């Protein structure tokens, strides 16, 4: 049996995840403000994690099990140049988004993914999102089961032959 | 709570396996196009610290003997996505590492050994002279030769 990494309210809302920084990192991208008219949709660095149980299952199957939790952690750009050269380097943490795959808890949602926003790191739980607010952009464009695995080299290298 | 990374008899670091399941501490990007088409370390960098040393870090805010840090390099795969403009990873390029050991590296700056790797198929690392790597880390890293000003996981996790 595998361990369940998310905790949920009676209404199936994901409680604010603790310890996700010790989950399995799958990739990082950066949409800086200065390259998006000074207001990026999701500022700015994005560090992404999958719970360890679903990583074991992805390692053996290449699919996201029932119970997958993915957390995307946002951080600011801290600087543009360092002794290694020019670019983007992280500053401080900004917030988190999450998505959860569960046919039992979300049978009507596209892919059985529930997308969660979080009003702060202090909040008790996430806020479940409307289909147009998140799932639409992901189904339209993500490379596998509504997860942008074209940007998770850890997942592509870790899936079986 | 045992040591990670394995070593030869000369205590040269064997190529670490499974470091993608260690604790990630931050990512940066130096694209080629912002560095006269040839970044010193192309391009994305994803950095990991071994679980035992992460544990000791949450308690003490210090790197213990036996700390292993892996910097994994990857290419920029694209500059625009539905989330907007920026940089997005592509394929993996290689790895660098550093190991702290007061016993085995007593005459290295901070007792850190620095390891380069010829390719993912190399069986072991190549220990570097202090001029090649430790000089730059010593001059500029925020804490004990590690660029913790770029690892927010480490900064938020110390007591
Ligand atoms: C990254 C994201 C993740 C991480 C897993 C993944 O599917 O990649 C989550 C949990 C999440 N977002 Fe999503 N999102 C988009 C793109 C291109 C990426 C990867 C590249 C990057 O990090 O920049 C995402 C795209 C979009 C998008 C296109 C216009 C929309 C409208 C959204 N995302 C919306 C949402 C959410 C609604 C508030 C939400 C909770 C998300 N995304 C979660
Ligand atoms: C990142 C690095 C790491 C990760 C841990 C850390 O201290 O950040 C390792 C294990 C490593 N490098 Fe080093 N390096 C430099 C900078 C600014 C950063 C963090 C920001 C980023 O990811 O870009 C590093 C700087 C330099 C440098 C300045 C001119 C030189 C000459 C080197 N690094 C050299 C080396 C190595 C010699 C081959 C080597 C094994 C390194 N770095 C390992």
């Amino acid at each position: 049996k595998g361990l369940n990494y998310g905790s949920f309210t009676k209404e199936h809302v994901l409680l604010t995840p603790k310890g996700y920084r010790e989950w399995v990192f799958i990739g990082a991208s950066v949409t800086p403000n200065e390259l998006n008219d000074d207001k990026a949709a999701f500022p700015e660095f994005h560090n992404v994690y999958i719970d360890p149980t679903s990583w074991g299952h992805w390692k053996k199957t290449g699919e996201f099990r029932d119970g997958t939790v993915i957390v995307k952690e946002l951080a600011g750009v801290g600087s543009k140049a360092s002794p290694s050269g020019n670019g983007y380097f992280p500053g401080e943490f900004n917030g988190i988004q999450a998505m959860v795959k569960d046919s039992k808890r979300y049978p009507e949602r596209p892919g059985n993914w529930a997308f969660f926003g979080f009003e702060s790191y202090e909040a008790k739980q996430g806020i479940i999102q409307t289909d147009e607010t998140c799932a639409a952009c992901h189904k339209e464009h993500a490379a596998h089961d509504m997860v942008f695995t074209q940007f998770y080299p850890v997942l592509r290298a870790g899936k079986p032959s």
Side-chain angles (χ1 to χ4, degrees), chain A residues 95-137:
Chain A
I96 53 173
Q97 321 164 83
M99 60 202 275
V100 179
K101 193 188 157 127
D102 205 314
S103 50
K104 267 68 181 160
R105 293 191 244 235
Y106 320 110
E108 320 302 331
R109 289 247 161 65
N112 305 315
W113 292 99
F115 285 84
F116 291 100
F118 290 87
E119 279 178 1
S120 91
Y121 285 112
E122 284 64 34
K124 182 71 164 223
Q125 47 189 75
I127 288 150
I128 192 143
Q129 291 307 304
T130 279
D131 284 10
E132 316 92 69
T133 312
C134 313
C137 180

Side-chain angles (χ1 to χ4, degrees), chain A residues 58-160:
Chain A
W58 172 276
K59 259 195 295 174
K60 308 204 259 211
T61 71
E63 325 275 3
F64 303 110
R65 57 180 281 255
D66 257 15
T68 298
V69 196
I70 292 157
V71 166
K72 172 163 277 156
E73 181 141 73
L74 297 84
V77 174
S79 65
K80 300 178 58 192
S82 96
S84 54
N86 296 305
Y88 293 103
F89 308 77
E92 312 303 303
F93 285 126
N94 290 346
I96 53 173
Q97 321 164 83
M99 60 202 275
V100 179
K101 193 188 157 127
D102 205 314
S103 50
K104 267 68 181 160
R105 293 191 244 235
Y106 320 110
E108 320 302 331
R109 289 247 161 65
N112 305 315
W113 292 99
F115 285 84
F116 291 100
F118 290 87
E119 279 178 1
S120 91
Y121 285 112
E122 284 64 34
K124 182 71 164 223
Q125 47 189 75
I127 288 150
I128 192 143
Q129 291 307 304
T130 279
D131 284 10
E132 316 92 69
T133 312
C134 313
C137 180
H138 278 248
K139 186 182 195 167
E140 193 66 31
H141 296 121
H144 182 67
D145 195 0
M146 298 178 60
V147 172
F148 289 96
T149 70
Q150 59 271 56
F151 309 134
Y152 305 124
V154 171
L155 284 176
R156 301 197 317 278
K159 81 180 159 197

